[PDB]
């Protein structure tokens, strides 16, 4: 489902931004 | 699905902290 | 739901272990 | 709910990396 899926992607993107910093 | 969403808010929030706090 | 919820908790706990390291 | 679970595996995996890699 839509609002769950978007927040999952958002989390993935936050983790992608963190991966980079590290 | 209110529990899953609630946990994803918390997670999202923990990561935006961690983010910033880096 | 059960296997989704456990993995959400697991993630929270990983983030708790990360919070500490940081 | 196979998509949500799949995204949670990926996330879990990204965090155990980040973990370790710290």
Cβ neighbors of B10 (< 8 A, separation 6 or more) are C12
Give the method used.
X-ray
Cβ–Cβ gap B11/A8 under 8 Å? no
Query: Could you give the CA distance from residue D22 to residue D19 in angstroms, rounded to a whole number?
Result: 6
CB A11 within 8 Å of CB D11? yes
Instruction: Give the number of other CB atoms < 10 A from CB of residue D16.
Output: 14
B15 at the A interface (CB within 8 A)?
A: yes
User: DSSP 3-state assignment of A1?
Assistant: coil
Collect all residues of chain C within an 8 Å Cβ-Cβ radius of residue D9.
7
Query: Could you give the CA distance from residue C14 to residue D11 in angstroms, rounded to a whole number?
Result: 11
Collect all residues of chain A within an 8 Å Cβ-Cβ radius of residue B8.
4, 7-8, 11
| B1 vs C5, C9, C15: nearest CB | C5
DSSP per-residue codes, B1-22:
-HHHHHHHHHHHHHHHHHTT--
């Amino acid at each position: 489902x839509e609002e769950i899926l978007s927040k999952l992607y958002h989390i993935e993107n936050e983790l992608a931004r963190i991966k980079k910093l590290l």
